[PDB]
Amino acid sequence: GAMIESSTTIQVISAGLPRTGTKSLKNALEIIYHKPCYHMFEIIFNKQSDIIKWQNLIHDSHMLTTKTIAIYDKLKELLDGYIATTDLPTCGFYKDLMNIYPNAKVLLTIRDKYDWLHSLRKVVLPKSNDPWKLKIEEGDKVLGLNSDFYKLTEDSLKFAFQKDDLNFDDDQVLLECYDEYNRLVQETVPSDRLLVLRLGDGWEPLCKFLNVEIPNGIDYPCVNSHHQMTQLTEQLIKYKSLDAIIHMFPDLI
């Protein structure tokens, strides 16, 4: 097709929860648009200073009114220079992002609920008594992440699930929240403005939805498996720096 000049503003809002292929989507969107896509990895690797801003934003998020305008302004500030949002903490703000970027299209990445929970327990939210949690935390300290990072994850999940609090160790609670979240998105977002993606779908329905060519000679990204995060965590602990191992994870980070 012809090359056209794309606007550097949020064009794609992905409501999918963590562990539903958000990092592959992030990579895919950056291949299509040639500008950055927001993701928790963007915070972790490029903008740790955003952590407190997202935390402040979620804090005020219970509140067009005037209180809303201040919040929408900070959302816009955080996302300046990006062409899309994925992953925590953005995903639970999909309703607001749709108001802020009226010309953006909405994606929902879904997958088998037990596969999701299993993946989540290995990476994002291990149980308190799970020994692997201590390894995750140790690898994370190497990246410069502390308890405020875990708090951001916790609070952005509560916010996505619209819960005042959440028993994070409770599998049933999380599964019910997962199903209701995905249901609510499809109920809320007008169908012409929404594409539901399943893992393995690849380029075609995404590119169709976005009116772009499928990228030539480039496979749809398949990164950020829990197996890969286990290897990353272990290598971080082993070498005690990111820059000593960064070359071993070329696409993932």
Ligand X SMILES: Nc1ncnc2c1ncn2[C@@H]1O[C@H](COP(=O)(O)O)[C@@H](OP(=O)(O)O)[C@H]1O
Q: Where are the alpha helices (DSSP H) in 85-162?
A: 94-100, 113-123, 132-142, 147-160
Token pair 């992953």 is found at 87
According to CB under 6 A, which residues from 158 to 177 bind ligand X? none
Question: In this chain, which stretch among 16-24, 72-80, 153-161, 186-194 interacts with ligand X, using CB under 6 A?
Answer: 16-24
Output the smallest distance, CB 23 to ligand X, in A.
3
Q: Should residue 199 be labelled a site residue for ligand X when binding is judged by CB under 6 A? A: yes
By the 10 Å C-beta count (0-12 exposed, 13-18 middle, 19+ buried), 114 is classed as exposed
Q: Which is nearer to ligand X, 71 or 89 (CB)?
A: 89
Q: Which is nearer to ligand X, 20 or 235 (CB)?
A: 20
Task: Give SS3 for 194.
Answer: strand
244 φ, ψ (degrees, to nearest 5): -80, -15
Q: Residue 24 or 235: which CB sits closer to ligand X?
A: 24
**Cβ–Cβ < 8 Å for 245, 239:** yes
Which is closer to ligand X, CB of 21 or CB of 92? 21
> Least distance from C-beta 120 to ligand X, angstroms?
8
Task: Using alpha carbons, select from 236, 253, 228 the residue that is nearest to residue 122.
Answer: 228
Q: Which parts of this chain interact with ligand X (CB under 6 A)? A: 18-24, 87, 115, 119, 199-200, 220, 222, 224-226
